[PDB]
Structure formats: structure tokens, C-alpha cells
Design brief:
The structure is a homododecamer.
Chain A (H helix, E strand, L loop, with lengths): L11 E6 L2 E6 L7 E6 L10 H8 L1 H5 L3 E7 L3 H8 L14 E4 L4 H5 L3 E2 L4 E2 L1 E6 L5 E7 L7 H17 L2
Parallel strand pairs in A: 3-4, 4-5
Antiparallel strand pairs in A: 1-2, 1-5, 3-8, 6-7, 8-9
Chain lengths: 166, 167, 168, 168, 166, 169, 168, 167, 167, 164, 168, 168
């Protein structure tokens, strides 16, 4: 497993970034906070409100030296097609955050959020600091969505403690 | 998976006539089944193989044969790909089943999974009414294969089953 | 301690309404349970998370949810912290149970024990009436979490066990 | 053993090449494409149209830098005798392609096409690239013949891809 | 010797047709079982032909003759259908048994594993499936059919009259 | 830990004069150390052993002896217990160190940890200037112990080192 | 031999009221027992500890407590030492039992034997009426032991075992 | 003792032209050797085989071939059998060597010893000039063994070994 | 074997009165038995001892003692040697049994086999009516052994059995 | 330990002339040695053997032979027993060493330890100037050996190494 | 085992008793004391003083219920030849004690007196009681003669102690 | 284990009675000479000694052909001497012209394989040993029966004869 106070497991994969395919990795985020979250599958009948809320609020994360990356076991071609589906047809539309592909499933496995039975991720969220250390993790059962505002709050509070103690 | 052996059992969610249906190797008993594998939905390779099989499905249906295409994508990707129009790299209406191998086990069982990238080679299997493999072939990821040759194979196997080899 | 698995059994002495009561996971069979861990009694940190949970306890009860707080301190420490008034960094009265983990085994089974120092990370578990873990989260030692977001989640899990579709 | 994207298994054996005995190996094909195909037995009651069709079209393969060799578990003496039986009579007449003998059965075994029970090969075909990597394999039950034109089409199509990738 | 002939089964060419034969078809008779390397070689085929020419002589003393190679039964038939004047066998009075799997030659200790073909081995097997005589040659030397006949007669004589000298 | 054994090395956070300080066995070289374990802070049991040691602390100091009390409680527990006044059940001012054994390893190393409930027996150790255990004592119950007698023992060990064991006769 | 556990069983020959008697741990069932070891009879160390326990033997008797002294000497030596007058380094009259541990197994069982020299450390055990060890101490050296502190210890055990652990 | 392999090495005492002489396999380098085993000297079986070989010995010399008969008897039995006139079941004059295998080790090494009764089967071996076994045969019982046919084999090996397999 | 222990078992084919007979140690229950070994039939040593034993055979029978001569030769050599007239180095007719040790196991079990050359030392055993060894002697290959002394020893054993042995 | 073999090693504290002294087998090289064991100091059995050896000790010294008594008692008991009036069950003055075998290893190594009660049998050993055991004897009960006979044996061994 | 307080090891053998061969065992001596002693060899140039002295005194032993048996590694035939040699001629003459043969040397081995190098017994002596317990043992080197008077004193002393244990 | 014919005689060393006195003799003393080494059960038996006496009388006849005769039993050398000093008319040996070797340890009989382990005495075995220590002849009789000295002598001459001559 990953665990709070421990260096985050290394990851590398193909992501959709600003409608391009780009390889990314844990090392790209050196010196920045990272919010890494998992979701089960592209294109489902579940409302993409969590992914869309992170995309809508990305600028709030960017202004506190924090990046946001979404991950699922779908291919990077699925992610791009999801992105190019209009919001009114189940789609994501424009994304302000990277959608990373975990086609081999190793990333979800390394992050301890893979359901091996069905072969998809639980809804896991990780806040990783500028040194690759995991500060916060949470995991929800497949159906339930979580608060963007609360994640932002946490990221800020980690920063506050860095700079001013407890 | 070898010619003359029973085909490995498979079960999964497929897109069949725009709906999600559980299908399995046993659903095909008494029928010929062309099971073929492709790498991924929505790539920049035009889906001409899948589309050609779909356009010719009724030629298979008239010889007591079903056709099922398989990839490691989920059944949701499958449905979205069907619902994307052809002019946009989609499949549009499909006359064949699109089977999801999300767990990758079906591809593994058929000896077509590339483990590194986590996707399947382009492998094709003709399975007879008792579930025995009569023909397999496997192509490297880029090259498309021939629908009319597949149909000829299927009919050649039926001819032999009814008449024999001697000439 | 993974989501979708049954919570590990626990048993220990808690300070429940100013008495010592032996308490176990079996006591919550048929209810939701927020089980959270904190590092230490009597620190120089604002115990705001613990108080916030006691203040909003009625609201968790109103949705059939119990709240249990837990740390590696003795039950004697918990009592002494409760009897310290809030104006002096104490807890004052508490509407939630404070479970003592003196043997450190409950923090160990919930995967939140730091073995070096011998105290628990700030871990939180939402457990359903079948003892199944629906949600977990862990924060590093200093940062407090949000009670209202916890309640929101308990409600949202309940909504799903009745409709499962927060979307037309 | 043999799978697409892997280097083909090494082989060496005696072949009939232009009515003459020659020792040939996979190494003799470096720099060239190779269609290697197996058939069950010389002199059968099944019209050998597959072998004849390949020999007739050997020129077409030669023109796109591709050699063709047929293999069965028969001895090279059976191969030559069959080549010397006229087509009128169920023979092969002359042959524009190498006829390789797998008398020890080890070639068929290495290519995963030997049936151990009767000791003869299934109708397997392999397309092997100039670096000896397998690009295509197919296997048929003993009775059914494949299409030579479709095999040519495939060879040309793998060539097309090394030259131009694919983006439609 | 003083030992049972290993069991064998296979497809033979017998009077121009395919028959499945086994050691058990030869209970109550003498069997001469000989192996040769390959059909259609350039070695002179005069051993097989002599056995065919003299087959009736062996029948008259209740003895069958079976030639075996590792060729298929199709090869056997094709070799039988090639005129003698062309290096073929022509009409055959004895069974030509196919050892395609090579297991018969292996069981009889005559298989050269490396090239995968039989040496020129001959076995005289009695009515109870006991081996009375064996001989093996290194090379395309041919053996005398008359002398084989003599040995069969001599084994029969001994079993009827003992071996005491007159 | 038996007698003529060196005392097991220990290290930890202690409250010393109302302030947190890291201490260890090394700090006591060239001194006598009285090291004693008690089960828990804040119990209903009489705290008097700790108090008597604190009151008489100067008397141990005058014979080159230091006194350290230990339990499995955190150092925060210990301080809160110190800031709890005596009338109220606390310890008030402490003239001796209160060492925290949060990890439980010190109790375990000194053979006094009860692993079942995870707390220490009431053991006392007199350790000499070379870190050799001259005396050990263990009680299974909130029975007290004379601080006067512990001082007597410490003086006696010094007497015998200086004069030996021969009876005046 | 650990506080909370049952005292190891012992048996052997003691001097009691100038006489040889077999005594064992079972003889003290229902009573308190101070059992204490010393190294040797007739040394040049003052036997003030042994004499002091003897002098206030009846104060132990009055609280249902017996005192047994043990070393690895024979009972013949014990008797001789009892018969040496105190001005000469002897014991004179003894009101406590002097147990002989000639095989050394008693010291070995109580974890007080120094195998190398073959004599006991100065260990003292307070054993309750059920055979449970309530108190133990071991000294490196003849530093004496307060007899009055052992008595106070005995009475405090008796008080707690009746009343519990609370602050009167 | 298998065709195509080197003949096991042997050494022992033989009767040669009426005398005792140590012979070994190396004595035969550069010559063909016919080496044959028989059970016992002095039985009630007609010694037709040994006598026939002896009478045609010079025909084998003419093609550079030597003949050695062997049994598990001592050289003394050999000599005494030689001095027994032919009309009494003796061998009379011998033109071939009679080798003794008293320890039974030659017969073991050649794969012809029956251990239970402690005597050799009727094995015959043709060994070429380099000591390779070209031909072996073994008979149960005191059936014949043609000498003209043994000779013809020796001539045939010589031919092929110089000319090859083709006629 | 050793004086005092039961004689090892033996069984084999003997020449008895010019004919082949299967004999064994059991055939001699109730009789004394003189069992001696010699190296080989038909050697250049005078068969002085064998012949002397045969001349005195009835003297042994008179005292209920049999005599068996043994060697590693076959029973067929024994016969030939018996049917060779004494003046030609043969034995001429024999009044004692000549037992064949062809397998060499009898000499092995009696402790007189030389494994190197494969023949027996000159060993003699006197075996009582219950099969106990009462006397053994072993000699160098060239030696003279006396029948009269052997007969004396047999009688003396018979003496001791009847009358004890107190001076 | 059997006759004709080297005596096992021993080291211990003895009472020699009213003082404690460490003595060992090595101290006796070049000399004969009578080493004998007895059960316990201060028993009710009259100390008859030990007193006799002490009385005749000079007769042993005269022939180059020390005498050492040994039991499993401590050297402090030994002293106390020596400082007890002979008319009180005591030994009074002693002219021979009293060796303490508190660890019982000496009794063990000389094959006279009774492991059950933890004390030695009445064993006696004559050891020669090179450490070789020349004579040994062991009794069961309290029954007494003869000092005259032991003295005789010693003289007899000495005579032998000189005459035969 | 040959150690004091232990049952004496069993022996059987041929003895010379009153001029006749007789087999005797340890069992024959049940209910009686037995002095069992060993010497190296019959017919030595060392005069047989030890043996003769015991024989002279045999009846003083019988008075006290004690048999005496001498043993060495010689055969019973040497014993008898030695007894048949008059004392006036260097021999033993008439013997009033049993002379046991230990030809196999097993008796001497079992009594721990066999010197394995030369293969003869040391001069050992054993007093065995009526139930076969060894009460006394002693061993001298080969040359040195022991005392019959002393051996007799011992036997009486053992009996004395048995009849009335020795206090003072 | 025992020795057999064609083998070198096991070395022996021992004390023998030679010319009425003790001498140490070993196999080495007999190099360059023939040796008759014979075993008998025991001195002083009621079986009067034909075998031994007969060898002594014929002693010179063996000395004449370069051959020594040594008699051996498991008896001590003192028994040997005592037996020699017993006059023949009394069932003794009288003068001996042959060495009488003593095998007290029984090793020599054991090494020559003539030792009966049950009773610990030799069988009546005789060995003829050559100048080079090689056993030419062995012969063993059961305990009661005597061997002929003439035959033994005939044998020695026969062995010598064969060292000089062939076989007509």
C-alpha cells in the first residue's frame, strides 16, 4: 500500500493534457502539491460531477502551487473521446486537468485502489506534497462523490502548517 | 487455445443491438462463432475490419454463424464508440456483438494479450458448433484482415462436415 | 482496513457519558459508525476536530450514526481530558464515546498506528450497519478534518442504499 | 513456443530445392520475408491445391522479396518422389518452392503445430519478417486449404506498414 | 531374447488397402518383423522384394512377414504403386506397416533418435510372442531371405524334435 | 534485567521542571539512579509514592543520586498530571523527572511490562554510577513503598562500596 | 518466580524450634509467607537481617504471616549456627524457620541462584495465602532490609486484597 | 554392444593353432572380426557352427577377416575339446581361435551373458577394422547359423564401406 | 564360513555315476560329507587328489560319509573329463560326485573363490550329519592333500560324537 | 575416575591452619596426596575419621604426603566446625586441609556425588607425585575407614616405586 | 553399575569350589554378604598372600553370613591347576573360597576393573550386601596387597550399622 | 575378521615361553623362515595334549627344513610356564622344544580368525607361513579333534618342493 507520511508510489503513463497525449510521471510534480484521484470508468451512466468540479475549480488549485490529475483504467483514447463528448450527452467537454490512463492497471494496483474482481479503481484521492510524500488519502466506495472544496481546504491547510506550524 | 481443442470458456458484458447483455461461449452451442480480437476502441486506425464484419454479418447469419468482436475496453467505451458516427471515427450501428474484456482474462485465455501494453493482438478464431477451434490466426497490431476469407473458411468447414475431403 | 471489506473487530474501555464502558464493534451492528483516530490527549494542538464531532453528534444520531473517537491513551487520560474545561485546552463534556487504545492494537488493525512514536495517525472510517467499511481517510498528524463533510458522506451513503442515482 | 511479435524458432533441415537436396535453415532467410507453412503428409487422398497454388504464385512472392517454404514430417525422399509424380496422377509436378523435411518432427514441435498423437503437423502458416520476427500466424484443421492470394495480400500489407505506418 | 516382443499397433498397407494391424493378429503364428530406414531412397529395395517374392514359402510354414518403416502409410502405398522398373515396389505379398509416430522402432530398440529413422533390424517372433532371433545391420547391406526361412524352419524343427545330435 | 547485570539502555521524553527534555541512561553515569515504574497517570489510586519521592528529592541529590519515575503515558499526559493540583488529585510541582514510555519498550526492557493490558508493574531499580543494577523491587498492587527505605538502601550501597561487607566485631 | 504468578513449589528440611522438620510451600496455604534467601551461614557479615526477622516474628504471626529464611547450607549447619551465641557471630534462639536448600534447586526455582559460586542472591518474596507472589526484591550486597517495611508491605497487601485499590 | 557403436574391449586366453595365447580386441585393429559366442564346450548339441567356421576360415582370411569363437569355459576345456576327435563330438583341428571367458566378463560386456545359468547366448558380431559393430545377431536355441551368409555380410560391408549405399 | 557354523547352502548339477544329477546340501542330511574344491578340469596338474579320493570312496561310504568334488567348470566338462581315460590326463570313471559350480556361487559362499581369475582355491570341508562345518583346510594351487588323513579326521569326529573325549 | 588414570582437576577454598586458602590439584605435584570426602560438617555421626587423620597428619608429612578432607559445605562452615570444641561435636584444631566443594563439581568429578541429596559419599583417593590415582575406595553408610591402613597403603606405594 | 549404593552387576561363570567345577552367579549370594575380589593372574612370581589369607579366614566370614569369591581372567582349568599346587611348592593348595573364572573377561569389564591394554583385572574388592547392593568398593594398582583383617572389620561394621545405626 | 590363503599373515607380538623363560616374539622374528603357527583352546585341560607334545618331539625335523613351530592359546604366559613345569605323567607338558605364545588379550586369535567369541578361546587352527610372511596353508578343526604332525611336515616339504620344481 501507499500510506500517509510515506513517499508516493512512482507512476508513469499516457495522459490527455490540453487535448494532447503526453506522458507524465510522479517526477513531473516535484516541487508542487499534487492531487491524484481515481475514478472507476469513462462514459458511465454516473454523472461525472467529481471530475467536472475539479476541472471547473482547477485554477484555485493552480494558484496554490497544486496540480490535479484524474486516473482510471481506461485507455488514453477513451479519455480523449470522453473529453470530446459534449456535457449534455454524458461527456466531459473541455478539461482543465490531466486525465491519465491506467490501461495496464499497475497504477491503481500500486496505489491500493484496484478492485481485482471487476478490474477497475475505487474512488481514491491522494494529496502528495512537493517532495512526493503522501499527506492525505481517502477512499470511497464506487458510487459516492466527494467535495472539491474540502480537498482544496486540505491542500491549503497543509501549506499553512508548512509555513506556520501547528 | 489450439486448433482441434475446445475453445477456452468466456463470459462478459457485450453490446448487442445497442443494449448490454451477458454473453458466454455456451450461448453459441450449435452455431459457428467467429470470435475476433482488436486492440482498443477509438484509435486513429479506421475501424474497417470491425465495420466490414458488421456490414457482412448477414452473410454469416445465413450460414448458421455468429460474429463477436472483443477488446480490453469496458462495455461503456463500446457503447460510446457505436454511438459515435462513422464520419468521426465511430462505428455507428453494429450488427455484431461487441464484447468487453475489462479484466483482460478473455484475451489472456485466448493467448492474445500483450501483457506489457495490456491490450490484445488482432487474433481471430472460428469455433464450431461443439465449441472446438477449427481455425485461428493472429496478426500484428496494424494490419487489417479479410472478411471474405473468413466467410470462405467458415463455409469450407461446413462443406467438409457434410461431404468430406477426397476432392 | 480497505473499502468494501468488513471493519476489523475491536473491543476496549471507553469513556461513555463520564463512565467507563467496555465497547466493541458488535455494539454498532445495525447502525452506521464513524470511527476516528487522533494522536494524543492533552497536546498543544487545538482539539477542534474532537469538539466539532461532539457538538454535531445529535445530527449523526438523527441519521442512525454513532461516533467513536480513539487514541492510544489510557481511559484515565480520556476522563481527565474531559474533566478539563475547554477554556484550558480540555474537552469539557463529550457527546461521543472516547475509546482507549492502550495496547495500541486497534490502531494497528485499522492500519493507522505509527510504530516508531507509538501513536495513531488521524484516520477516519465510515462503517455501515453490516460492519462494512464504506469510506476511509487519513491525514497527517497536524491537520484537522471537517465534520460537515463527514455527515454529508454518511447521508450520501444512506441515499445510495435507497436510490443509488444522484443524477437524471 | 511461436507467437506473433517474437523471433521465429530456429530451424535447419534437408529440403528439396529445384529437384535437389539442400540443407536450409531460418538463417538462410535473413533480409527476406518468409512464408513458412506446414502440411500433414505427402501422397494423401486430398488434392494438394494449397501446395500447387503456392508454387504457381512463387514468382509473385519472389518479386516482393519473400521466400516460401513448405514443411511436412515426411522424409526428403518422399518429397522428391512426390515432386516426380505428375499432377495428373496426384503428384506435385515441379515445384517453385522449397519442400522441407521435418523427419525428426522437431520443426513442427517448435512451431507449435505438431499433433503428438498421430505424429504429423496441422496446417499452420507463418509470416516471418527480414529480422526473423513472426508477423502473422494462422492454423487450420488438417482438411481445409487457405488462400494464396490472401497470404500475398498480407505480406504486401506488412511491407506497406514498415514503409508508411497507419493513420488512414 | 527368451523374452516377449513388445506390443505394436499401426496402419499397414495390406493387399493395396489400409488395415490396422497389431502383434495380436499374430498369436498362433510365427512373425518375421523387419525394419528398414525409409521408402523411396536410392538404396536397392531387393530385401523387401525378395520377402514379397518368397512370401508364400513363409505362409506354408505358418509364418507371416511384416516390413516396417517410419514412413506414413500413404508413402507405403505410393511406393507400392510405383513400378519396379522405376525403383518402386510393385505388387506386395507382405504387409508394409507404418511407424509414423516412431514408437514401434523405439520399442524394438531400432530407432536412431538423431535422424529419426530405424536401422535394419529383423526379429523372428514365435506363436506366443516370444522373440527367438534378432539381427541388426549398420548399413544398406541386404539380408538373405532364404536364410531367414531356414531359421524359421529351424526354430520349428527344434521345438518339435529337441536339439540332441544324431 | 537481573542483579550484576548492567541496566538496559533507555531513552525518552520526560517532563523536567515543567518542561520537556530528552533523557537516557547515559545521563546518569557517575550518579546513582533510582528508576521506578508505575502503571498509569490519573488513576484513582493514591499518588503518594511519586509525591514522597519528589518531596525527599534533595536528600537523594545530597548523596549523588537521581530519581526518575516512568510509565507508558505520553509526556503530555505527564505534564497535564503535573499541572493538576494535589487537592484535585494531580502531582503539582515535581522535583523528579517523569519519563514517558509511550512505545512501551523501556518497561519491556526492564522486564516490568504487563503485555495484556499494556502497562507497567510497580518496579523499582537502583542503578549505580557504572549503570549496574544493585537492587530491584517489584509490587503487584497499589501498595506503596517507603521512600525512606529506598534512601537507606542507596546510602548502604555507598557504605559497602566504601567500607566493604565485614561486620564490626 | 515473577510478581502476579504462583510461587514455585519447594520442599526441604528446616530447623524449627531447635528441631528438624520437613516443610514445603503447601504448609503455608492460607497464610502469608515472607520467604527470603541469603548466601551462607557463618560468614563475617552481621546476620542482623535474620536476627531482626526473628526478633519481630510475632508481629508477623499476629497478621497471619510466617517467615522462612533459606540458603544452600545443610540443616546441620543451620542448627549449628542457631546454637552459636550471638556475641560469637551466631544466631542464638530463632523464632523463624531456617530452611536448607542443600540441592540448590530451591534457589534455582526462585531465580536467585548464582550457579558459578553456587549460592543464592539476597532475594525476598512475599507470597499471599493462595501461593501468589505479591512482592519480590533482590539485593546485590548485604545492605540489610527493613523488617518494619516488610511488615508494612504485608499489611498493605492484606488491606488491598480486601478493599480494592482506591484512595481511603 | 549395439550397431554403430565401438565394440567393447576384451582380453583373454585363447587356443590358437593348438597353443595358449593372450588375445585382445586390439589384436584385430585393421581387420574385420567375426566374434561369436556359444554356451558350452562338450554338449550334446552338434558343433556344426564352430566346425563350419573352421572349415571356411581361409575364405574369411582371403577378405582380411578373422573369426573368434567364445564361451565361458576355461582355455583348458577349449584345448581338450579340440583334441577330441570330431567323430566323438569333439572339434578336432581348429583354424579359428577359441577364446575363453572364464570370468564371464566378455559375455557381460557384449550383452550376451545369461547371469542365472552363467553362460552366453548365441550372439554373433561383425566388427570392422576400426572396431565398430556393423552387424549383430542373437539366437535363442542351437538353430543353425549360415557361414556363407556371415561371409557374404563381411564382403557386403567391405563393398559399401568403400563404395556407398547406391548400387 | 568357519568351523562350528552351519555349512552354506549349495545346489547344482553333478556328474554321479556318469550321469547328470541335481544335488544339494540337503541330500546329505544324516551323512557326513567331504566337500572339496579344485581350480579346473583338464589342466596340466596330475588329478592325483581327485583320483585318490575316488579310489578310497567306499572306505568313506563304509563310515557313512559322502565325497563331492567341486569346480567352476560346467557339468559337461566334468563328463568329458570323466570319459577321458586316465593315461591321457583324464579321470577315467569316478566313484565320487563331480559338482559343477558354473555360476561360481558355491565357491563364493564357501569362501574359496578367487574373483580375479574366477576359479576356486583348493579348499576342503568336513560337514557333519546336521550340516555343521567341523573342519576346513585351504591350500596353495600346487599342493598335495591326503585322503587317508581326511578319512582319519572323519572317523575321529565320529569317535568324539560316540565316546566324548576325556583322557 | 579409575585407578591408573590422572586424578581429575580440582580448585577450591580450604581451611588451612585456621585461614582461608585457595588450593588445587597442581599444588600437590611432587607429593603424594590423600583426598577423601565426607557427607557434611556438624552431623551427629562422630567425626572419628577426620580427627584421626588430623592426629596422624605428621606421620603422613614424614613420608611426603599431604591430606585434604572435602565435603560440599562452604569454607565458612568448615571454619565454624574447626572452631567448635572437640567435646561439643566439634573438630578443634586441625592438622589437615578442609576443602570446600560448595559448587559440588569436585564431588561430581571424583564420582562420589549423590545427586539426589546433593552431598558426597565417603570416598578416598591416593594420588601420586605426578597426579595419577593409585588407590580408591568408597563406603556407603557412615562407616569409618582406617587411617593406619591408609598410611600403610601410602608407604607401600612408595616402597614399590623403589623396589617392586 | 559398579558404584556404592547401586545394585551389583550380574555375573555367571565357572568357579572352582572345594576342588570341583561348579557354575555360580550373583544370585547364589542373595540373603548373604559377599566379598568379591579380583586379582591379575594365576601362577605369578608374586606370592598369593592376599588369596591364601582370605581362604585362611573364610570361616570368620561365614560366622557373619559372608561368602568370599576370588576372580581373575584365567580359565577354571588354570585355577584348578593352581589349587592343585601345594603351597609348599609355590601354589595355592586347598582353598576355602570359590575361585571364579572370568575367561571372557566380561565380569571384570562389568565391574570396571578390567585393564583393556594387558587384558587382566586390577585388584578390586567389593562388599555386596544381602540384597545385592554394593556397600563398599576399592581398587589398587596391580602390585599392592590389601588387608583381609580390614575387609572383615568392614563387613562387621556394615552389619553393626544395619542392626543399630551409629549416632554416638 | 580372518585371514585366508594367498594373503600375508597378520602381524602378532606377544610373550612366549622359550627355553623355560619369557621372551617377546613377533611375526618379524620369523622372516626368511617357514612358520607353523598353531592354536589350541586352553592349558591344563583333561584333554591330554597329543597335538602339542607331538610337535615338540618332531621339532628338530622342522628345524631341519628351515621351519619354526609356535603354539598359541589365550592363556597367560605364567600358565604356559606352569604347564611346562608340570611333568607329562601328571598331564603336563614337560620340556618343550617349541615356543608357547601367550594370547592374553585374545587379539592374535581374533586376527587369525580362530577365536570363538562366546567362550573366549581359540579353535584348533594351524597356519603354514612362508619366508616372506605369506600364508600357504590354513587348517582349522573343531575343539576336540587332534591334527597329524607328519602331515603338517609333509605339507611344508611340499610347499618347498613347488618353489623349486614344476608340474609333469
Amino acid at each position: 500500500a501507499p500510506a500517509v507520511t510515506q513517499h508516493a508510489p512512482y507512476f508513469k503513463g499516457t495522459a490527455v493534457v490540453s487535448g494532447e497525449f503526453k506522458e507524465i510521471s510522479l517526477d513531473d510534480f516535484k516541487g508542487k502539491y499534487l492531487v491524484l484521484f481515481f475514478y472507476p470508468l469513462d462514459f458511465t451512466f454516473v454523472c461525472p460531477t467529481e471530475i467536472i468540479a475539479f476541472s471547473d475549480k482547477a485554477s484555485e488549485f493552480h494558484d496554490v502551487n497544486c496540480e490535479v490529475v484524474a486516473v482510471s483504467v481506461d485507455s488514453h483514447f477513451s479519455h480523449l473521446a470522453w473529453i470530446n463528448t459534449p456535457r449534455k450527452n454524458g461527456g466531459l467537454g473541455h478539461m482543465n486537468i490531466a486525465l491519465l490512463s491506467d490501461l495496464t492497471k499497475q497504477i491503481s494496483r500500486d496505489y491500493g485502489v484496484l478492485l481485482e474482481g471487476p478490474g477497475l479503481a475505487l474512488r481514491g484521492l491522494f494529496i502528495i506534497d512537493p517532495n512526493g510524500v503522501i499527506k492525505h488519502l481517502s477512499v470511497n466506495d464506487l458510487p459516492v462523490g466527494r467535495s472539491v472544496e474540502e480537498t482544496l481546504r486540505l491542500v491549503k491547510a497543509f501549506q499553512f502548517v508548512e509555513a506556520h506550524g501547528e
